[PDB]
Structure 1
Amino acid sequence: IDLLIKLARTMNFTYEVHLVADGKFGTQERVNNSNKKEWNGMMGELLSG
């Protein structure tokens, strides 16, 4: 958080910190319910938008 505040002042951007839905990091997690696989956790949220 302290490092993040430093970047915001330097590059002049605003933010709104929010937590993650499921307390897990990224993982490929290939499953049979989908075609090949889909990202889960923090990593999937970044790609979703």
Structure 2
Amino acid sequence: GSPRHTVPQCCYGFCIDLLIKLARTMNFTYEVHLVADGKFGTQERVNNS
């Protein structure tokens, strides 16, 4: 019901540190963002197409 306006915040925890171990392990960097809507995602007909 409100506009989105995704803001940067602090995020941490388990898989965060796992990905940090990955980026420290293999030669790459990363960029943390999150999903716009907190759903896993099920396959379903949208109203068009």
Normalised TM-score (structure 1): 0.58
Unaligned ranges ≥5, structure 1: 35-49
Which protein shows a greater Rg? 2
Unaligned ranges ≥5, structure 2: 1-15
Q: CA RMSD in A?
A: 1.2
Normalised TM-score (structure 2): 0.58
Query: 1:12 offset after TM fit, Å?
Result: 1.3
Pick the structure with more strand per residue.
Answer: 1
Q: Which runs of 4+ in 1 moved over 4 A?
A: none
Pick the structure with more helix per residue.
Answer: 1
Pairs aligned (count)? 34
